[PDB]
Amino acid sequence: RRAPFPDPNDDPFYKTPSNIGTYANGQVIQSRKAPTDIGNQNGADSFQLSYRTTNTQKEAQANVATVFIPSKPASPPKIFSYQVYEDSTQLNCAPSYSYLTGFDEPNKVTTVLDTPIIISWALQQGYYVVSSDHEGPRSAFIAGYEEGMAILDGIRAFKNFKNLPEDIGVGFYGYAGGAHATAWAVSLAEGYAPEIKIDGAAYGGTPASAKDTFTFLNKGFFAGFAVAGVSGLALAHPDMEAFLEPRLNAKGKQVFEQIRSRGFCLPSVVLHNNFVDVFSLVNDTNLLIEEPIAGILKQETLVQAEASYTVPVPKFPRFMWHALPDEIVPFQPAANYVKEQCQKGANINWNVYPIAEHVTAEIFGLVPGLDFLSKAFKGQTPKVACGSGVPAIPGINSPSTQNVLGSDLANQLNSLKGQQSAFGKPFGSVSPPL
Amino acid sequence: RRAPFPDPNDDPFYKTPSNIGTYANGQVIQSRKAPTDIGNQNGADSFQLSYRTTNTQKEAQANVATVFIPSKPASPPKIFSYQVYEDSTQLNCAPSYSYLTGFDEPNKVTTVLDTPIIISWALQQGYYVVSSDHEGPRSAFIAGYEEGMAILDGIRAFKNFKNLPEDIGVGFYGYAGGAHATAWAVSLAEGYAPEIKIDGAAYGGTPASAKDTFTFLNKGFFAGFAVAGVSGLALAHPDMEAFLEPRLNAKGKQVFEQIRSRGFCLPSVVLHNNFVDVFSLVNDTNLLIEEPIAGILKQETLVQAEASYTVPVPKFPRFMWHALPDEIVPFQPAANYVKEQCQKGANINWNVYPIAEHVTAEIFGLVPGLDFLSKAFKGQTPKVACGSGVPAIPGINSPSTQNVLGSDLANQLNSLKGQQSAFGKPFGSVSPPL
Ligand SMILES: *[C@@H]1O[C@H](CO)[C@@H](O[C@@H]2O[C@H](CO)[C@@H](O)[C@H](O)[C@H]2NC(C)=O)[C@H](O)[C@H]1NC(C)=O
Ligand SMILES: *[C@@H]1O[C@H](CO)[C@@H](O[C@@H]2O[C@H](CO)[C@@H](O)[C@H](O)[C@H]2NC(C)=O)[C@H](O)[C@H]1NC(C)=O
Ligand SMILES: CCCCCCCCCCCCCCCC(=O)O
Ligand SMILES: CCCCCCCCCCCCCCCC(=O)O
Numbered sequence: 083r084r085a086p087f088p089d090p091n092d093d094p095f096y097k098t099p100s101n102i103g104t105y106a107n108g109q110v111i112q113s114r115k116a117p118t119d120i121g122n123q124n125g126a127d128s129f130q131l132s133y134r135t136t137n138t139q140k141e142a143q144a145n146v147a148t149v150f151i152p153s154k155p156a157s158p159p160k161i162f163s164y165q166v167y168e169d170s171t172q173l174n175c176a177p178s179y180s181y182l183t184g185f186d187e188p189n190k191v192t193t194v195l196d197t198p199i200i201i202s203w204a205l206q207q208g209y210y211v212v213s214s215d216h217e218g219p220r221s222a223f224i225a226g227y228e229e230g231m232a233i234l235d236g237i238r239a240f241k242n243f244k245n246l247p248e249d250i251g252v253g254f255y256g257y258a259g260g261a262h263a264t265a266w267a268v269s270l271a272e273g274y275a276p277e278i279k280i281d282g283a284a285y286g287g288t289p290a291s292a293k294d295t296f297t298f299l300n301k302g303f304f305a306g307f308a309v310a311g312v313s314g315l316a317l318a319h320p321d322m323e324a325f326l327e328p329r330l331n332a333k334g335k336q337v338f339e340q341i342r343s344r345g346f347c348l349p350s351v352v353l354h355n356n357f358v359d360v361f362s363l364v365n366d367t368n369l370l371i372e373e374p375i376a377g378i379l380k381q382e383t384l385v386q387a388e389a390s391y392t393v394p395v396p397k398f399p400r401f402m403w404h405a406l407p408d409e410i411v412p413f414q415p416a417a418n419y420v421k422e423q424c425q426k427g428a429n430i431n432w433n434v435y436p437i438a439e440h441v442t443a444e445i446f447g448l449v450p451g452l453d454f455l456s457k458a459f460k461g462q463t464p465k466v467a468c469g470s471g472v473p474a475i476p477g478i479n480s481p482s483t484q485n486v487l488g489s490d491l492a493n494q495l496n497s498l499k500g501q502q503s504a505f506g507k508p509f510g511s512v513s514p515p516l
Numbered sequence: 517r518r519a520p521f522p523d524p525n526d527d528p529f530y531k532t533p534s535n536i537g538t539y540a541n542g543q544v545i546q547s548r549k550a551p552t553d554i555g556n557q558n559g560a561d562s563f564q565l566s567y568r569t570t571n572t573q574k575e576a577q578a579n580v581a582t583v584f585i586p587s588k589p590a591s592p593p594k595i596f597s598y599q600v601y602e603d604s605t606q607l608n609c610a611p612s613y614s615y616l617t618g619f620d621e622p623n624k625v626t627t628v629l630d631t632p633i634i635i636s637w638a639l640q641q642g643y644y645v646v647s648s649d650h651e652g653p654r655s656a657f658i659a660g661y662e663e664g665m666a667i668l669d670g671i672r673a674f675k676n677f678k679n680l681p682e683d684i685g686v687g688f689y690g691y692a693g694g695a696h697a698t699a700w701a702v703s704l705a706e707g708y709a710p711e712i713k714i715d716g717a718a719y720g721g722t723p724a725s726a727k728d729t730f731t732f733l734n735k736g737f738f739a740g741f742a743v744a745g746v747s748g749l750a751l752a753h754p755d756m757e758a759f760l761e762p763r764l765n766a767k768g769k770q771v772f773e774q775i776r777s778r779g780f781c782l783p784s785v786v787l788h789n790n791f792v793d794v795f796s797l798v799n800d801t802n803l804l805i806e807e808p809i810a811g812i813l814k815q816e817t818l819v820q821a822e823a824s825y826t827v828p829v830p831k832f833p834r835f836m837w838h839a840l841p842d843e844i845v846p847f848q849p850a851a852n853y854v855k856e857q858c859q860k861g862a863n864i865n866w867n868v869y870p871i872a873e874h875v876t877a878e879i880f881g882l883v884p885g886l887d888f889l890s891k892a893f894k895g896q897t898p899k900v901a902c903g904s905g906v907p908a909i910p911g912i913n914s915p916s917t918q919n920v921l922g923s924d925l926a927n928q929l930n931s932l933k934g935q936q937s938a939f940g941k942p943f944g945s946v947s948p949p950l
Pocket of ligand 1: 325328329365366367
């Protein structure tokens with residue numbers, strides 16, 4: 083069975099009406115039921131929402147998000163916002179289209195692997211689920227402001243549409259390209275959507291800096307992502323599009339046309355431009371140094387050491403993970419982001435997998451991150467030193483005192499509780515406070 | 517019942533013979549059985565060993581260590597070196613004396629609280645136990661070279677005395693002042709005792725920098741430790757003793773006399789000089805700036821950013837912990853040490869307790885650290901990114917996939933193993949490699 087809906091390029095549902103400027107951010111333009119594999123597998127209604135959002139230039143535009151409605155909602159109610167690693171600069175790769183039933187949707191890989199297990203879990207807990215087309219109508223992959231505002235306005239639209247309490251607690255999940263959009267949504271939340279109440283966010287494989295991810299990727303096997311990211315920023319930064327187009331050589335012109343063309347989604351992106359140099363595509367090898375790109379890159383980062391703006395520092399419980407030898411998305415800018423955030427007051431539970439890559443870490447931290455989000459929805463995330471994980475605690479995340487010490491010495495140790503230590507302050511228990 | 521042995525000050529066993537220069541480092545000068553509470557409680561023989569070591573000026577001197585001999589040794593055999601937080605600059609506070617039976621030993625608090633539970637565990641696993649008088653005959657508290665060489669030569673003496681295989685695996689434990697001596701022993705091991713085979717070390721509450729610990733402590737409730745540390749360095753640095761003595765005022769002269777006097781051990785040290793300023797004791801407020809102390813402090817640190825020498829970087833499995841709000845021993849120099857070591861190739865499993873103090877963290881990380889040392893003796897310490905702990909892993913240190921996801925979604929997730937991810941590389945399992 084083929085997609086139940088027209089190609090988004092051919093569907094007026096995705097067009098931005100001329101009166102768009104008169105809708106408020108988050109206001110619903112229209113809605114429609116949407117046949118989705120996930121909605122079917124959980125007996126949950128699914129819908130598409132057209133709604134107004136704001137692009138990088140601060141101009142109104144219309145966008146689509148997908149909402150799943152759990153059969154038995156949890157009380158009090160929660161919204162779970164799942165961010166897809168769309169990783170494409172073509173409109174028919176969007177999450178909404180890829181959630182539909184059928185077999186031929188070109189980016190279906192981004193919604194049928196771990197995505198359904200993750201969105202199912204949230205629905206089986208009673209959470210309301212939104213997943214926006216975070217790249218927006220301009221398909222602007224890794225454009226942080228574009229993704230951020232679109233995700234948050236997607237949540238406002240979910241709240242407007244199902245008339246949910248203005249203070250419903252929201253939680254975010256995303257990996258890889260989904261983690262970039264997630265990271266920017268929570269970064270922008272305070273400044274752009276202060277009325278959204280965020281209980282928690284779990285994200286991993288995070289591209290913290292657009293510039294550092296480009297350098298890490300260029301000339302490598304996954305250089306096709308560097309092409310994709312250049313295409314995406316240019317679609318959200320028309321001054322960079324204007325700077326790039328006259329610099330594209332004969333080959334470069336055809337490369338970007340291919341990466342913006344219908345059906346060229348994530349599976350295509352990683353099967354093309356392997357080992358290519360983006361600089362080979364353009365006459366200028368000085369593009370990173372010259373304006374406007376040099377300034378844009380200073381905007382398109384969350385690392386304060388590179389940013390030309392004061393980076394926001396979200397305070398709610400956060401859970402982040404990353405493969406140390408990640409071969410697609412570099413570990414160190416994510417580590418630098420975590421450190422910076424922590425020195426300014428963040429609550430980041432940081433999880434570094436030593437023997438992992440981008441793909442294996444996508445699963446490794448999946449279950450802990452959802453567990454963490456379940457606790458965040460209950461206001462019960464564990465206490466951690468920011469930028470670390472929970473330390474070793476007998477009976478909780480490491481062997482019991484009995485298992486390690488045996489019964490006698492475990493009773494001796496237990497009975498030091500309350501007795502004077504050599505430092506004149508009393509001993510505590512083997513377990514830190516819960 | 518009073519101590520079975522004379523006061524160390526009155527016992528020729530502790531004196532350094534005139535022929536000391538003809539003994540090699542680690543060579544046993546003499547031995548004797550020693551009645552110890554710990555040795556009694558485990559049915560294990562205990563002995564004292566007199567043995568040659570090297571002081572900070574590179575001069576031979578004699579020292580005492582205490583060895584416990586498990587009834588049924590483990591095979592292959594291991595040595596467990598336990599470092600005591602003696603925290604005194606008086607000879608009758610030494611660990612050896614405090615291990616003896618009786619009630620009046622003045623530093624007995626340093627050997628009857630967690631110390632017996634820790635040394636018992638090692639004996640019940642079949643490990644050979646040494647605990648040196650790491651401060652040496654000059655009672656030089658937090659003098660790192662003095663403590664390091666004394667601990668390692670104590671191990672050589674244990675090996676010489678019980679004729680143990682030259683490649684017996686050694687493991688180290690220590691907290692607080694014990695962690696400082698431990699930290700310096702492993703730092704010096706390669707350069708000074710390359711023939712010692714180290715399987716692992718677990719230490720916490722570590723004073724990394726003598727200078728930073730002084731500043732952190734001075735004028736606070738525990739300023740008495742700052743007095744003690746000044747006394748200890750001066751006892752291992754005679755040029756600093758010569759600089760200090762003519763600067764001691766009428767009060768200062770009596771303060772240091774009290775802190776060097778018989779029976780003035782850890783319980784006294786924390787009951788005296790509360791809120792005192794060390795600068796008030798001396799005419800000169802410029803002592804940290806002036807020589808020789810300024811240079812000595814640059815030697816008496818493990819933080820490369822302060823050191824005037826290339827700090828060693830041990831490579832064997834290490835486990836370190838620290839209370840983030842530690843009020844006696846500052847967290848940040850220990851964190852800086854860990855970071856520096858990690859950037860140069862260390863294997864440090866780093867554990868930061870967020871809701872803890874110096875005393876509570878003394879227990880919190882006790883059981884994990886001994887567990888870690890059991891694994892290190894088996895060559896089975898877990899893999900960690902250096903400077904972090906093991907990240908969250910379902911079924912191992914966090915809830916099971918079944919517990920978090922339920923049975924269905926846990927089977928869906930499990931069955932992604934081996935299937936292509938959206939990135940064209942296959943998925944792995946929920947559990948990282950063991
Ligand atoms: C590569 O092509 C670009 C695209 O035109 C060239 O850009 C122009 O350079 C001239 C001379 O410096 C300027 O007056 C124009 O304004 C530029 N046009 C722009 C901004 O697109 C460029 O000279 C060529 N060479 C390199 C290495 O960049
Ligand atoms: C405090 O007492 C010290 C101890 O003597 C004084 O030190 C001497 O200072 C003179 C003049 O600078 C030198 O010639 C001597 O060599 C110093 N003796 C030493 C090194 O102990 C010192 O002047 C006094 N004042 C301060 C603030 O330190
Ligand atoms: C000339 C360069 C200017 C702009 C370069 C910015 C490109 C950023 C790099 C692309 C991001 C790819 C992220 C990987 C996708 C994923 O892991 O999901
Ligand atoms: C004028 C100052 C020069 C030398 C100052 C060095 C003093 C170092 C500080 C003392 C260390 C105390 C460590 C705490 C003991 C423990 O926690 O076990």
